[PDB]
Symmetry: C4
Subunit: 388 residues, 4 copies
């Protein structure tokens, strides 16, 4: 077994093809399925896994009341092969209400944060054993990616944040080798608020498209040099913006250096990646709610902050149906590196009051250089008929 270095060019991409769907909420009306949220996907050299943060409870269960709450001591990072729903034989790989995982070519790394809001601990679990940990540095909800980290030649990188949800905060980027934190760089550059980065290998470095919860409905970019540990940052230029909330298609604008100040407060986890000067991105369909999900290529959208010219739109989830978090993962092909993404499909409280719980299922697509059609793949559970 060798270390991955992702030392191949990015595949041609013309759009995305369907890859996986777990139907978790529909199955939970007739079986024992975990309540989850904040799911993500990552793969070893042979095959993909789905992760999510459980709630220490199944759906048809009295302990699913009040599961809208994000941080409890019962929350654990769940791990199955992709397309195995989170049944009772699912492995909890650590204690976590915020997490990140990745495989370096030899073994798995997980970064798992739990404990008090004002004094959380991050544990670093590698090849099936604890190897390091850090405390919260700013004592305000230490939190990480909720998607995969990236590893090159044995060095893995992970973005972490501690501090305000609506003001300046303290973002750091960790470099980790066989579970050991070997370096800590601090966030530098134009990015003013950074959370829940979706990162990908872009040899010889790593790149991340994050969420700005403060003043931006445009999305922060973070660039990580894995050899000298240097960091630069900025925003996704595209006139069509990735966050939710945001302004509409006509009213919106963006900027390659600063946040845009356009209904910037709050946000959602999302993704984007470069293809020459064009940008591939996904976002919720609805501008102010987590309803629907779409992807498109914005022509000249990676370098020109005026560009509003999209092409190759696909509806993933129609605008009448719930979506949520989304993020990227990368898959090594024969000659190239592919990009794929997953979409969290949130159901229940507080937006849906027919049930006392909050949970999600997932749908997953992958880059293709071939051709594709249209459809819509929502959660599809009927909450009027769920547990009593």
């Amino acid at each position: 077994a060798e270390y991955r270095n992702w030392s191949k060019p990015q595949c041609d991409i013309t759009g995305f093809a369907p890859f996986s769907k777990d139907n978790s909420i529909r199955l939970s009306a007739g079986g024992d399925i975990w309540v989850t949220r904040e799911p993500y996907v990552s793969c070893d050299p042979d095959k993909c896994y789905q992760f999510a943060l459980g709630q220490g409870t199944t759906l048809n269960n009295v302990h699913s009341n009040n599961t809208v709450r994000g941080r409890t001591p019962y929350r654990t990072l769940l791990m199955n092969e992709l397309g195995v729903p989170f049944h009772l034989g699912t492995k909890q790989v650590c204690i976590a209400w915020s997490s990140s995982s990745c495989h370096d070519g030899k073994a798995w790394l997980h970064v798992c944060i739990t404990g008090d809001d004002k004094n959380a601990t991050a544990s670093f679990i590698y090849n099936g054993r604890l190897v390091d940990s850090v405390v919260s540095w700013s004592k305000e909800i230490l939190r990480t990616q909720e998607s995969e980290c990236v590893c090159i030649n044995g060095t893995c990188t992970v973005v972490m944040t501690d501090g305000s949800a609506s003001g300046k905060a303290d973002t750091k980027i960790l470099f980790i080798e066989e579970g050991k934190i070997v370096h800590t760089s601090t966030l530098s550059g134009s990015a003013q608020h950074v959370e829940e980065c979706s990162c990908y290998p872009r040899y010889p470095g790593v790149r991340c498209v994050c969420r700005d919860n403060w003043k931006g409905s445009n999305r922060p970019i973070v660039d990580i040099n894995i050899k000298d540990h240097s960091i630069v940052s900025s925003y996704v230029c595209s006139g069509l913006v990735g966050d939710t909330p945001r302004k509409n298609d006509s009213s919106s604008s963006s900027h390659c250096l600063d946040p845009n100040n356009e209904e910037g407060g709050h946000g959602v986890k999302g993704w984007a990646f470069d293809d020459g000067n064009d940008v591939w991105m996904g976002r919720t369909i609805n501008e102010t709610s987590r309803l629907g999900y779409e992807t498109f290529k914005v022509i000249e959208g990676w370098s020109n902050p005026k560009s509003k010219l999209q092409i190759n739109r696909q509806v993933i989830v129609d605008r009448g149906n719930r979506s949520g978090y989304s993020g990227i993962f990368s898959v090594e092909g024969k000659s190239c590196i592919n990009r794929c993404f997953y979409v969290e499909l949130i159901r229940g409280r507080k937006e849906e009051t027919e049930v006392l719980w909050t949970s999600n299922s997932i749908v997953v697509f992958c880059g293709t250089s071939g051709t594709y059609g249209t459809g819509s793949w929502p959660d599809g559970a009927d909450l009027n008929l769920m547990p009593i």
Copy 2:
């Protein structure tokens, strides 16, 4: 690890012996089993797997209401080792209301079709990753085999159809190397309507026996040259015919080149294979309805369209009991290649009104050169008593 070539002679066959049975509906009356249809069987070099299209629901579940509908966003391809029923830890391997799978000797190929009726997408998954996709070419329900594809020297072959269920349609044969469509040939020869092919290796080529939903109750044959990508097609000569519906034994007839025009409308997925100039085949016992299942050898049935001489009949499922789709799969022995088949046992709507759902179980038999007796191995569930 080497590619499969299937370059051994077909094994001597005197009939078929019991191999496997899943008892799925019976178990679902007291456990969490998937609602499914369109099952099949395929084996890696070491062992067999059972596949089926799920409905995104378990049976004892509110969402099983109306599972008679065949194409929904929630349909996924299920995959287990043969004999493990589709319980809640079953892996969904891709999004699909139509699919086909094969192992090339090194890894699994899956072909999965989902999306809108008039603009569906076929995904090609090899060795656990998306490698290609193709759009619907005629915008009328792109669909494929619902049984195993066939690989020789690392080239896998799949038959896909797009277009009318009751008229000329566009059928294509794809050639896939490590998930990648390297060539597309179009249907040629005298077969007029081709659907749901049961294919098998017949060195140095591949051979398929299909369903004609239009004018034929004899079954079409497609022959695939794997090296120069040429196609030829025709029909199974045999005067005892394989489709359902069809005419009775005294009234039926056939033709080696054209559809017989006898009760041709509609059909069922089925199988056949040659033995010198004889044919081994299976079919439902009833002519008009999907009731019972039987196999036999028709003497000179592969070359003589007037032969009605069967020997070695076995009853697999008795005629008072429901059957369904069936198809072929090939298993390599020490000196020779064997032939086996599965039979879908459909239960529930719309034919049975005791329940609101539609699902199946399966029974599987394999070629033998030994001896055997008689029995009947139906589904055996009691719908009068099932959940509610």
Copy 3:
């Protein structure tokens, strides 16, 4: 991987130590567990498996009514690692209402019998594929061991009976190499009625202790020479006899060549093995019904029919609890071959009328050269409190 020769002396045995218990009926009052009967145990070179004939239903399931019936089309052979109860993820390895299994050191052999009473088929499955099959020869309930077969240098042997349950019958010993029946020898010697053999390796051959359902409450012995395929047979000499029913300890007698003719009608699967000229054996404690279970050594019991001298008694299940079938299996140690045994703990109809079903659990013990104590390990379910 190499074939097993079992070419090692038998380990020293002073008695038996507890090895495994699955609590299957106790667990089924609060979970989805298979209904079974006729369990057994066999091990590959690394680990042990539990097998049983399923009834195609779980316990808390309407289909469990009338599971007292021994032969239906829904019965399949279940296979789990020893100590994993038969839950929903359990593999049905073949269709069977009678079976035998063994590993030759390279792969598993399964001998599976299903079909009509008067025309049954025995399937032979080796390394995940059907290699052979044979018809019922006397057209009267073709039946086999219901415990492990034995393989030496790649030739496996198995005992099958077709014919009357209370008269002369046709018993055969088959020689199987990689699933292929290579030779068939017919029963010879003085054994008069032979059923359900518990066989074990005794280099350079195989020995079996079987059930006489006709005239003997002593048990038959069969010696198999694996090289010339010759067969000899007699009975277990011991004055304390192993079948149930039987006469009490003061009234009973035996014969080394003939059935004792003492309450010889009916029987139960049991086991014995030779230690020098003494015999280890188990049996039900109650002489007329399947209640309690016990093991002991009979001094000179293998070579003298007048000996009633037992030493080293162990109670496995106390005389107030239900027992059932029992059989042997052999485990290869560093320097020697150990002998172990399992016991079927039958619950339900007809003997108990508080429930409608009939199932079992199991308890397993192994040979030891060390020391041990006392106890009783019954089924332990409260039928008073089980599902209506």
Copy 4:
């Protein structure tokens, strides 16, 4: 594969970081989960496993009534990968109402005790087969560690006690090679009563920290030489004592050689380990009953019986939440050996009257040389809402 030697120094430890949590009871309110007690953790060279003593029943089950009882014939040792909850697919590796397990680098050893109180049997299973067994020597509840044993260069060691719970008893240390008891040493030195040892490797030997149920609220220590089989014993010097019950922080005292005589009767399994002259130790937070759990380091606590100087306190479970047993295991890093511990969270009878069963879940922490914060990780089940 080579034998583990543990021939590396103990890692730097600044405290403990969160590792695993199973949420067992919370999940049992809406799924099929085993009732358990006396759990522990042990790892093979790749990964960790969780173990427990099942009550031969699930929680939502009539047979869960009165599971407060500690010894029945239905209790078995359960084994899953760490963080996979005890669902119905869980392996019962042996019959045991007391046990210990360990991996010698090549295969697993399990030591399992079952049978009559006055004549129990201990079985020794290695590489999936029974290799030896020994009887109760003093005919009074033969019992062992309830935590991992320790193996060096292929010699494994385990502590067993037989005799009174409130008087002198007979404690022995067994040396086991590939399952074979090769030597038996009797307890020697100044420790007066010894139960449930938490043992760890300390090259070239093994150290244990145990429970004195007779006259000490300070914990016994046992040192074990693996080459000459010698044994020395004493107590944990620390003026802050680890047993429950015990006297308060201000009133307590200890001694390096003899039991302190302070609320000595009864006890709780627990752990400690040495760091130079310091001791790392955990204990329940309440002095009298099993509530809360804490860890700290005592300065000079290992070698000075007067020190009451603690530092580096962590609450693991808060004072208002039930705790229970706890123990140590050890994990091999690149350069050093880490120490981890688990905590049993008991719920139900007799302390909690709302339900009829008695069961538990677990939380698990590992030594870290990095930094960490605060929190509390209780069981989290609401018993008033549990299956009544």
